[PDB]
């Protein structure tokens, strides 16, 4: 029986719907109003083998910040819901992924205690129209509602898109590991 | 009897109308042609319990600068008008507000002598489409027409939107304090 | 009608019961198995005018860590419960308190987003039998379950007991401010 | 047929009995006379899925050193015995585990050649009553009798209990990996 | 049906034949005219569970460079051929292996885009008769024809043979992981 | 008989068609969806006397990265195809071109071994709407599919458009030299 979490959340600023299947096939269905974030959520699905359905609208004329934040918060809650009683899972994930010259290590523990350790140094301010400060905020907000211990470490990288995408690949693979069944539990 | 100041000001560059109620309920009604500034003026209303009505148009195809400046000048004048004879008010305000990792101290004196002390270090050039140099200019122009002594001190912060928004929260709360009745005066 | 939050939480390591009245009279009733923590919780009650009832037992033969953490987590949850819908409160608190040569600034926002900014430099490892690393962990854990934005800044201090106690005084006064009714809301 | 190693060792200073099942269920049964070490050995069992039975007595009135050392030596020998001919196992283990802000990488090879690489910087001298110098000595002594190549690397951390516990989690998971069957061997 | 790639390549300088089975049993059959390289290719087979058959002759009286390069190029092509359509594989590999005091991290992606990140600092010029500059060139040439993203990071090490051998162990294990079936794909 | 290479390549992200005549007249016919890249490809044609026909579409709403990369990859392949057996050509090219204050040296070898040496320091993040990180990626991707040894050295320059355009002029002239007939071969 697949582990599925669903969240709908509305504020004056944003409207967000998330559905995540931890036992998915990598089905990617994300439309946030932030194209670069959509691309990253596609990576989350494809590299994590999650099914990810996201819809968001919001006040992107002000900036992408509120949308990005509210999407992340809802994803964190959806993950928490999907995990249920967390019985029999690996709990810990650890993966280091490259994307060309970029190399990003992610380690996480589905601990119930939120913590983000993050040291990315993204050398440009905009990837497409996406404000690169928002990457940290995405992970911070996700951690806060999921109750995840998450460390993200930049080991190499120069191209901003590579750095951010490698982060999502590594995160997805680490989260896949953590959420999967431990065969001895 | 509520303290209300109104200003209409037209130049070749901009057209601005401001109405501020110092004894308001936080009614936010701001449309400047600069969405991020609108968002900040909403914070001013909600955190200061001012009623803030602003309309502006201007030469935003050149850049947001003239609009931002002329809005600020008019707000400063409206504040001055609303304050009237300044009898029986606290006069001084002092508040430090966070927004997540950002922490901003504002101290002000409704002194009749303009002065801005400002040390924000906003680490990105654009929040949405808003040029972050314009934050200092907003406060400088406001001080100049209001005749306010204003100090803004960045105690912490990394996210530009957080830094700027925390500034407006702290300013609003400090200005609320300064404009309110001193119960012993 | 007084705002009261109650939490009972048991783990393999600890057993904790907390009851907090936000609208209290400073009634202090704290027994955690960690005498220095009891003393600090007494300060929280007396300086914040909270009624604080805490009972904890745990694995203090290993060290005080699990007890300290679980007490803090439960207090954060109790605060959250007590706050209820958070209508009409100040929400923000800001206070700087001395204790002799020590001087500690606390700023907080009852925001729903956990964040701790903390820069205390406590110059000794043990105050009585209390491990001074546990002060940061107390506030971090409290923030995490309460969903509080909390900044703690050491402005001066040399004596470890003074530094820590001044922190609790400042925190208590800032939290009192934040939880109290805003008379214009 | 489960791989079980047993050691009894007596000196003038200490008396130690160890039984370890490499193919266990995480049964934790450790009483060394050093409560913090007991807690760490519980982590070894739970995170490694070893069954760990330890009893020790010794000259803890002098300090915990001889007990800690003799426990570690006996565990290393028990591991060696349990491994038997080492046929068909992964041999290598590599895992990085967090505990909140702490992040510890362990890499090991069941090589038959003892080596410890260790760079932990534990910022306090006592965790509970446990001398934090003894952590290095525990791993060194274990390596020496097991004939293990072991590298322990502190990637992040501030709280001493977190640093040490994360080390044991990472070690346990790496040792589980190394001792498990390689499905292609 | 085992994935086997075969390459024969002749130049004026060298003559090389390679056959690699990705689904092997660790059969090592390598004779390049460079004994140290043979030893490393044996590690590749044994730690990766590849079957590796290599024969090379060349102008080693000039130096080992052309042989080393042409062997590496052919291995990269053989890997590419063996991988075929790359369907259903893990694609990514990440492993850190010790050899006594040496500790080497390898991360790779079978991406189709060649990239080598390499930071080994091998402290001697010759291991046996093998020029230690040739290690980097081996991996660079392999990457270039395989279309692999490869990062090699020296975490510790002093003995040149240990450093280089640990690199091949880590690489072999990471490449095994990447080339193996993903059980959910 | 003119040396013409043609490539059509489609991915989920981009659709690219390239036709290059090494023995051209400088016919420029490039439409990539990235106006600045079009301008640079026009320089390639005019300064190299290549006929360059490029059409690309792609996911430029995410950013220009995938388009830029896929165009470059296809150009590299087209060059490789056009070169055919590479008989009788100069093979090496070396040219240094100014554009006002900018001065860029390009040296290349049509070697069959991909390598990019690149040290441009482009002082602004956007030239028009073009992300200046993409210049390095363009040349890297081109090198990777063409099998070119390419060195790009910034000798002087301040204006980003000048720096990048001078690079394309120098590259075009060096590539013209390398691809032309050696009159003694
Ligand atoms: Cl590392
Ligand atoms: Cl201060
Ligand atoms: Cl030169
Ligand atoms: Mn935010
Ligand atoms: Mn991408
Ligand atoms: Mn101006
Ligand atoms: Mn905002
Ligand atoms: Mn803890
Ligand atoms: Mn005291
Ligand atoms: Mn000793
Ligand atoms: Mn513990
Ligand atoms: Mn060479
Ligand atoms: Mn060897
Ligand atoms: Mn790319
Ligand atoms: Mn031009």
Curated annotation (Swiss-Prot), chains A, B, C, D, E, F:
Mn(2+) 1 binds at residues 39, 66, 161, 165. It comes from Arabidopsis thaliana (Mouse-ear cress). GO terms for biological process: L-histidine biosynthetic process. GO terms for cellular component: chloroplast. The chain holds residues 74 to 258 of 272 of the full protein. The lineage of its organism: Eukaryota, Viridiplantae, Streptophyta, Embryophyta, Tracheophyta. Its cofactor is Mn(2+). Keywords: Amino-acid biosynthesis, Chloroplast, Histidine biosynthesis, Lyase, Manganese, Metal-binding, Plastid, Transit peptide. Mn(2+) 2 binds at residues 65, 69, 137, 162. Pathway: Amino-acid biosynthesis; L-histidine biosynthesis; L-histidine from 5-phospho-alpha-D-ribose 1-diphosphate: step 6/9. It is an enzyme of class 4 (lyase). Its main location: plastid. It catalyses: D-erythro-1-(imidazol-4-yl)glycerol 3-phosphate = 3-(imidazol-4-yl)-2-oxopropyl phosphate + H2O. Belongs to the imidazoleglycerol-phosphate dehydratase family. This is Imidazoleglycerol-phosphate dehydratase 2, chloroplastic. Substrate binds at residues 13, 39-47, 65-69, 91, 113, 161-169. One of its GO terms (molecular function) is imidazoleglycerol-phosphate dehydratase activity. It is found in: Plastid, Chloroplast. Its EC number is 4.2.1.19. Binds 2 manganese ions per subunit. Substrate binding triggers a switch in the coordination state of the Mn(2+) active site between six- and five-coordinate species; this switch is critical to prime the active site for catalysis, by facilitating the formation of a high-energy imidazolate intermediate. Weakly inhibited by inorganic phosphate (Pi). Competitive inhibition by 2-hydroxy-3-(1,2,4-triazol-1-yl) (e.g. C348), a potential herbicide.
């Amino acid at each position: 029986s697949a582990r599925i979490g669903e969240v709908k959340r509305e504020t004056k600023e944003t409207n967000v719907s998330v559905k995540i299947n931890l036992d998915g096939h990598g089905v990617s269905d994300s439309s946030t109003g932030i194209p670069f974030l959509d691309h990253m959520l596609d990576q989350l699905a494809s590299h994590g083998l999650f099914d990810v359905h996201v819809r968001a609208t919001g006040d992107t004329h002000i900036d992408d910040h509120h949308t990005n934040e509210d999407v992340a918060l809802a994803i964190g809650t959806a993950l928490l819901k999907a995990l249920g009683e967390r019985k029999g899972i690996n709990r810990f994930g650890d993966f280091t992924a490259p994307l060309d010259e970029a190399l990003i290590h992610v380690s996480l523990d589905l601990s119930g205690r939120p913590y983000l350790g993050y040291n990315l140094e993204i050398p440009t301010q905009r990837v497409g129209t996406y404000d690169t400060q928002l990457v940290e905020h995405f992970f911070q907000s996700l951690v806060n509602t999921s109750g995840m211990t998450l460390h993200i470490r930049q080991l190499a990288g120069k191209n901003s898109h590579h750095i951010i995408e490698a982060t999502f690949k590594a995160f997805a693979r680490a989260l896949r590991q953590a959420t999967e069944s431990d065969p001895r539990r």
